[PDB]
Write a protein that binds this ligand. Structure first.
Ligand SMILES: Nc1nc2c(ncn2[C@@H]2O[C@H](COP(=O)(O)OP(=O)(O)O)[C@@H](O)[C@H]2O)c(=O)[nH]1
Length: 254
């Protein structure tokens, strides 16, 4: 019984440390196809399940311009992982949570690993794990590569949540009447197409001028957008995500 897992996260949040802690010496070097960027893969067993762990290049966000974000995003959207672990810096969680929302809009299964929880405790931070699960709709595990906190529970959660396919997660962030109308237009236009991607996600990246999806959207016959229109959609979407994240932090962090 094999489970394929990807580690996603911003640069310098503690992904490598968590990767090492989970896999030990059972890891291997290789290259991603077509680039020189190192691909790290590791293996660990848990209750007779065998987990293959891929560490993705660090990404502040999941655009499509830098080679690291191309690699990571292509894997997330087009790859074969059964679930993803979003590794977040517990101490300064804002950018990590923004990255998470991006993944949730792709409609992939994700576990939130709030790592460096030892530095959170040390600095007097109070993080409500159940408030996080409530606003994010996914399993949350507090981890520390320094203390070992949560490592085993994360392994348990990986096999448990990989086997839980009856109850699904759904995020729909309301972007306001205007952006929602345009999303509706785009979904209705792609309704009879063979999108290998979530249409709401497709529409969002198209409106905001994503290099991949804006270009593909136009290909499929959607209207071209001015620089001002793309800049404006991108800003509105970003602002709404930031607002949601600020509310999550408000509710879950004391
Ligand atoms: N306090 C604390 N520090 C950590 C933890 N995990 C990683 N670090 C430190 O955070 C820095 C970045 O960690 P690293 O694994 O290289 O992050 P990466 O860039 O995401 O691969 C390093 O200095 C680590 O020593 C943790 O759980 N607790």
């Amino acid at each position: 019984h094999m489970v394929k897992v990807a580690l996603a996260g911003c640069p310098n949040v503690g992904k490598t440390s968590l990767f090492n802690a989970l896999t030990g010496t059972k890891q291997y070097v290789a290259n991603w196809p077509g680039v020189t960027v190192e691909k790290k893969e590791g293996v660990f067993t848990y209750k007779g399940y065998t987990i293959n762990l891929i560490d993705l290049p660090g990404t502040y966000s999941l655009g499509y311009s830098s080679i690291d974000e191309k690699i990571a995003r292509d894997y997330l959207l087009k790859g074969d992982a059964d679930l993803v672990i979003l590794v977040a810096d517990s101490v300064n969680p804002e950018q990590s949570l923004y990255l998470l929302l991006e993944i949730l809009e792709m409609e992939k299964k994700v576990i939130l690993a709030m790592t460096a929880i030892d530095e959170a405790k040390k600095t007097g931070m109070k993080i409500d794990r159940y408030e996080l699960q409530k606003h994010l709709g996914i399993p949350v595990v507090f981890t520390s590569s320094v203390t070992g906190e949560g490592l085993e529970e994360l392994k348990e959660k990986i096999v448990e949540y990989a086997q839980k396919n009856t109850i699904l997660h759904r995020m729909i962030l309301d972007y306001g009447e205007k952006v929602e109308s345009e999303i509706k237009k785009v979904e209705n236009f792609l309704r009879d197409k063979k999108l290998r991607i979530n249409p709401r996600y497709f529409a969002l990246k198209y409106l905001s001028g994503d290099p991949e999806f804006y270009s593909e959207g136009v290909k499929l016959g959607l209207p071209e957008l001015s620089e001002e229109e793309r800049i404006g959609y991108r800003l509105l979407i970003a602002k709404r995500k930031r607002e949601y994240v600020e509310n999550v932090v408000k509710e879950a962090f004391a």
